[PDB]
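Holo prediction — 2YQ.
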Amino acid sequence: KSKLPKPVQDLIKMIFDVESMKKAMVEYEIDLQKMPLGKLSKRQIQAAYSILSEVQQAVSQDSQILDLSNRFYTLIPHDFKPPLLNNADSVQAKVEMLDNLLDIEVAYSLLRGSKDPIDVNYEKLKTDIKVVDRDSEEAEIIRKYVKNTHATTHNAYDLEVIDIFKIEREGECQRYKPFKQLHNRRLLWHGSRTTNFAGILSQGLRIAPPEAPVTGYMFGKGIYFADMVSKSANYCHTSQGDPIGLILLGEVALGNMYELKHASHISKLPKGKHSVKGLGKTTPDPSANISLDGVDVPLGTGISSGVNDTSLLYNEYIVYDIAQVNLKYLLKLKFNFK
Ligand SMILES: Cn1ncnc1[C@H]1c2n[nH]c(=O)c3cc(F)cc(c23)N[C@@H]1c1ccc(F)cc1
């Protein structure tokens, strides 16, 4: 029997849920026979990324695109008439599929490679996880952040916080050290599919590989965060059939922000800048900022930023070095769909 709190045990089950892994693969139309969880290979996936990059290029300028489509389906067997990879959104969906596959492989490997099994798998995450007491001020601050920064245009659901966890990944403090005293450190959201979280906890937030198409990345390949909970929660890809999601709060060392109103695929920041801020029309009210253990929490309700000429409804924040993030909390959220 495990010594871990029930909420933590429930999180471990959730994150190592093999059935969720398989359901995801069925929804992607992957052939589970020909490409089982244990068989996923880093080198095949890398080659698949490159083919998707060639596809995107061929689309941007009918026979050759059929052949590339087929080369992709040979590398990543599907179980379908096979849809042509002939537009940016289709390509993007396959890239996101490959990302999700990669983290699923990580989860499956950890799982397969005397004590209660929940405890054995907990240890494999190499992450200290503690429950934040529902009645603490810490929890209250976090619930406020969730409540106040739900955007008015994300009306498909409300959020309810079920559990709040405090997390410390092995090695992250040391890795974050050079950034620990950069100025402008902010507690920001990052949402991702549940089936990615074993990978995220064991390896941290990562940046897309060189081989991946840049298409879809408004500010280039980086790690993206929001100051509005719902903007991030949308990337949980929850649904009525699976309405429980996981979302992170990260301390992000933003330093001097390169403020942008429109897409720009950053390959190198201007010297002296440490992050990108995509400027939204709505921003959390600066007067309501609260410090939490030295870090600003922009938990104000949304007001007008005064920026009209922008591509974005809400802010986003991007860093280009994985060491500029120190993960602090993990929330289990129930999405109540309307
Ligand atoms: C899909 N994805 N994969 C890695 N990162 C993400 C997204 C993202 N994930 N999670 C967040 O919380 C987030 C919060 C934002 F303000 C903005 C975000 C994100 N945009 C990122 C984005 C969107 C489309 C795209 F093609 C590439 C990147």
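READOUT: The longest strand covers residues 157-169.
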